[model samples]
Target: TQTFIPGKDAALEDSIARFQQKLSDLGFQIEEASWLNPVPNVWSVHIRDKECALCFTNGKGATKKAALASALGEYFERLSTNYFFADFWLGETIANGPFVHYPNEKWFPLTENDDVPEGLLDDRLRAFYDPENELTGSMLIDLQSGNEDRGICGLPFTRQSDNQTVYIPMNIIGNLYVSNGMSAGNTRNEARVQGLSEVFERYVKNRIIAESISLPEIPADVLARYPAVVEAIETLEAEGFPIFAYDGSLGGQYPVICVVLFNPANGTCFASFGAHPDFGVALERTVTELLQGRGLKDLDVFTPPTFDDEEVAEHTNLETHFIDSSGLISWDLFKQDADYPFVDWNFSGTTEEEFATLMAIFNKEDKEVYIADYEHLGVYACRIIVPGMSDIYPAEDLWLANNSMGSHLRETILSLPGSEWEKEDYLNLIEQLDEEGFDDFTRVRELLGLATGSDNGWYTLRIGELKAMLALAGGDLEQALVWTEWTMEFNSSVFSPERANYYRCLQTLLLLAQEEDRQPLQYLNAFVRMYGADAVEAASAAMSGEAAFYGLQPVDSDLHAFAAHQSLLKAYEKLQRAKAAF
Candidate 1:
């Protein structure tokens, strides 16, 4: 024999009955139940009122101030749509088919209709209908209109194409159908069956029984494994952590922590905490560590006392200052001295106590020691002491003009200390040393002499000689004679065996000369002798290099180019001065 359980035996049926009864007692009467098939085990519960069947209208006494009550009603209606009907009836079959269905055949109305029983419309309902005045006519209009009569199929009852059916507004039919015995057909009954099956399979059996059992019990292994968890829980209870519960199938898991810190000195208070376990634990640890580090020894480890009335009022005017004193001291305390005339005084008065305080703080006398750390590849450190305080200084500024280059120099000079020159003095000494001190200029000049005798490599050598002379002369002369002489000699030795280096040297000198002075004519002449005037012009036009002698535009040159150009310009200016003197 196949075992069959009555509808009352199912958990979903019990929930639906409970929900329905609760709603009916609260005055929301269900009108129609349409099983929403696509949404497995779901139903749309249509509810209404006679005056405003759909209950969409904001009735008399409904205002923003009474939003809470109105919201509750809306919430009830929303829940009834899914929870009461959808969970039980969508795919379930009717209990009785091809016969009378109890409770589904009854008719409850806003007012006693000719067919409906008179006693059904009690004083409470009469009061509900009194405001509308034409409650019976409205109900009939709603029924005749057929708008709220949309059958228990979740689809519109009256076909738009069929104009014969009167359209009833949904508001006028609130909560009457279920009370009036609206019957579910075979399809609705099937929905109800499927809905109950799902409720048992997914919710009752799987979620409530099986999955719930899978969770570790509180008094079992969980409590034994982490005994501290129990202690912590007890502590939390003693401290009175707030717990909030809400209704839903999801069950209760939410709790929040609120921490309040009160300082009585000037009356200040603040609070914060996390809602989750992990976050709460972290926050608690951080706060505890902070309090301990701040030397708050008197603070209670358990719940703190509430602020007094006076403290609370004072707290309103208090300001908070967060301090991290790992590497800091208060300026006021550090600078306290008798001459300042403000030390060791109460808030109410000023006294001549600064000198005595300063003497007490600075009475210590010991050998003053200084330490310096230098780096040739980065910034170097130096220290200087002047009686009261010591100052640390960087040494990179002494050798390099640019901070980045100075920093690099610092790394190389790390082992040295006071041996490094002062910044201004070092720069001045270098300026006074003259061009002979620069190694690059001297080497190119020597090659110019050798390249002057070559034949095959003379053109290349002439370029080098020009650059060399320019470097040696540093921008002191604009005359092309020195450059011409060098080039002529290089041309004479073009075929010499030692041509490579000599050629390179000459080219370097020519470039150096060009950079030192903006002598377009001399550069043009040098280029013409080596590779004709057009080639010279093209070479000059395309002559892009670090040295400014190669190009006419100064801004386009790099730092090395600018240095070379300035040297040549300086040399030419000096030559002009010598000429004036002569």
Candidate 2:
């Protein structure tokens, strides 16, 4: 991972030129090739096939040759690896096992797998796969491996050392969500080593995030080895950006480094992590990634949003921009009393030697590593999957872990807006809170009031509705009116037909409670003006306790009309009892 200087080496220039000519002969056009600024140590290129709009590739590296070669390499590598394309699985359709059932002709069942460690048998896999259940699963196959066998347990894969066939679930062996651990290099040994290194990187990084462990500073001696890293740090410090480097390696066989660049003037903090067998390589990757954040114009501004005066709410917004670094742990600030031992392994071997070394380590640890080759048109690439490792690939488990509700009402309230839940989910949360019955209704009231305007208008519908309901339950009719009015406006603006009318009815009830001369008939006429005569007739029928009222239908769907009818009936009953006093 040493820095590559452009035009410094004749061979590097020759390689870039060669790749460019090859791409041109293959009818590929270079869409863009540029250096990202702030720290111009990285190069990126975009290449696309002329015949197809979707046939495009992107590459990034520290030198022009490396970047163009990567782009060219992927074009050939992905041509065979992509299962969605027609050429990936061109053989006979299999009856079972993890094969790409591309043309609706095969089946892969999620049976209990053999030779799997207890650690790989996670809760998600257990819940998803039942041995007795007859399930049709989407399959994936490594065309490089000629063996085709599916046992009662799971998909069959033979190990390279022992040639023993082991079973693994499809989810473990391959990813349906993303291309995890897919790497390419000039040789199989190079590709395999890089692929395994990436898996270890993600595994270690995930454990750190889960435990919320603070990374220790990269020692001064380590930074001294890479002159480019030293120069980058010096440049940032000179430009009023305080740099913090950390050893993000934990519970892994390789090194993972994290570098945080803080723009003190703008409060913009950028952090990036790198993983490799060599410590210097990982550090270089981390610094290079960190600099990209400073130059990317389209990246979203990431400010640590505050929910209260005491502290910023604890929600996950892992990005670089306007960040609150007041609570972030800095080894420079707290290393005097720290005791976590920093670890590093310097790998100075050939690609094949490195591959053998990692394989030996995996064998000693009783971990299984599965790799599938995707070699085509003189390009060497492979997909390596190490099961039980938590990948940053987009999946349900990772999503839930990041956005799960807290144990108590206070925590849930603080993190509500950031969670990936819908209206039904919010309603369920309120129901659960009500069922638990807060020890202090007064405290609940105060929390709800504080949360009203904290969501920055993103979740006003749910927050405002809850606030309005709580205010009414506490007999604050004026506050209820305010919240209900606001909620109604938000619902109407979003065209939330499922509950817009319900809010309207609730607002009418609040209006009746506050005023003396407002009648049900007056609002009925207004409702008619808004919903037409058919809806007015249906409303009258609903008030008169007709269970089969069907004269008014908004979308004409039975589910929606029934709910709207229920809302009408509830509103009518409330008005009748209040009108009796008048």
Candidate 3:
């Protein structure tokens, strides 16, 4: 219960002598104290304990120092845990283990054959029967009797020391003993106390002096190649592009540049930008190009004078203003096309219903239609592209057109005459068309001299026709009955992955169609055999004809419906399992 305090100059010399005397009294040899300091109002002392001295001497290098430090640290860490326990004693005890005990005798049970009086055999006795306490008294009497009889009921009971039949309850005695013992031990352990204090001091000091480093150096050549890095801000400022100038850290790490293009009339917008370190340079160049009458084409290469001298001179007459970070809008805002012809139908309202209905129409085709939602506005619009149409009707049609065109293009290049020059030319033309926003068949045919009014032209009747003309050359469906049982098996097999079940079923169906001599239908049968009846059926429903397929209608009934049904069933099954687990 005493606090040790050292006088102002005690740690200099007098404390050493006092500490040495104390060490001698304890049968220990005194050693020098390093960087010793005074404890105010008390004597500064360093008494050596040989056990600790030997331990330190045996340990070598920083390892010994670290070990000593850690030992000191652990002493303080225990104090923190104990402090938390003291602050929230009840909660801590429940979270950790209960501070009580169950003695050996408390867990034992009694039986009917045991020697006891008849009154002790009552239900009240059964409830209060403590095997550890063989002696029955008023405390046990009150608990057993359930407050029915007042005599001898609420009094405390003490077990007779000499009585073998008497026993003490472990929980009560054990808790008291453990709590008192720990309290005393903590008070008397001065070495642990001092070691903990030293650890806490070191931890505080280390935390106060913590530091870190970062290096961001770019090669000189790479910087030279992109000289616009220096001219970026001036160009951006001159071009009427929004600039954010700050005297502080704004133009440093994690710089941002956002360019928003909008038509104020109908809230339509388009956006583009460059971000992070060095992105600001690219963004500034892009804005400058736009201001000089260059559209999307000059984005990649930092070319100069995108417009004529007259236009540049006119632009220079306009005033420019810089804005705060929040005033600069995100480029994504520009992508909004409120007045875009199919925006309402493609994104909301009756358009969604129309798309679903169109898909249903296509589901009646020869190939299954499996439509995944488009991730971007461009993709959604592109999905509905048709051969002759100038505008898309349903969003999904753009995807179908693009997919068909790509497929047709691939086939055409593969069928080319010298496989070397023709194929490369065809691929290069496709790439050029893509870059120029002329990927539609009408544009391509006109470019390649295949338009109707052109001197050299070819008609596109089928998917193959488009391919054939591109390479400058040429080249070149079922029954029912006893079909009821086959239909059930087909449905089940599609849902199951059992190799022998679905795989064999498809093979059998193909062979059956072949044996029946359904030659024309044999190709259809073969396709079904290869990809499974359900898959083929779905495909047929979704993509059977040019008009329905191009319109995004469900034409291939079998394949399209089957695929959708299977996907839904899979999702449902997963939900069911999730629900059960939850």
Q: Which candidate has the highest lDDT of all?
A: 2
TM-score: which is higher, 1 or 2? 2
Superposed by TM-score, candidate 3 places the C-alpha of residue 201 at a distance from the truth, in angstroms, of 49
* lDDT (tens digit, per residue) of candidate 1 on 1-582: 222122212233333444445445544444432211111111122233322222321111011112222222333433322112211111001212211111112223333342322433333333433433433322321111122122211111221122222222122222222111111111222222222222211221112111211121122332344333334334433444321111112222211222334434423332322221122222222232222212233333332223233332221111111111121111111112311121111111111132122222223322121111111111111111111121111112112211111111211121111223333433342243233233212322122111111122222333334343333233322323354345445453443434333333344444555585575565545555665554344333322221323212212111122333233333223323332332
Model 3: runs farther than 4 Å from truth? 1-255, 275-283, 292-582
- Model 3 per-residue lDDT tens digits across residues 1-582: 222221111122332344335334333343433311111111111222232221111110112232222222222222211211111111112112211111112222222443232323223222333333343222221111111122111111121122122222221221111111111011112222222112222222111111101112223443354344324434443543333321111223112233433333333322322221223333332233232222223223221212232332221111011111112222212223311111101111132332333333333322122111111111010111111111112122222222122322322332332233433454354345446454333432222211122111122222222222222211101211122233334333332343224324433443454476556464766666676776555333322221111111221211122233233223223322332332
lDDT scores in order? 0.25, 0.47, 0.25
Regarding lDDT, does 2 or 3 come out ahead? 2
Assess the local accuracy of residue 70 in candidate 2 as a C-alpha lDDT between 0 and 100.
54
- On a 0 to 100 scale, what is the lDDT of residue 556 in model 1? 18
Q: Candidate 1: how large is its RMSD?
A: 40.7
Q: Of the candidates numbered 1 and 3, which has the greater TM-score value?
A: 3
lDDT of 2 by residue, 55-172 (tens): 5666555555566665665555554344213111111222232333222112232334423233223333434433333322222222211122432123433345566544444333
Candidate 3 matches the true fold with a TM-score of 0.16
Query: What lDDT does candidate 2 reach at residue 314?
Result: 24
Report the number of the highest-TM-score candidate.
2
What order do you get sorting by TM-score, best first?
2, 3, 1
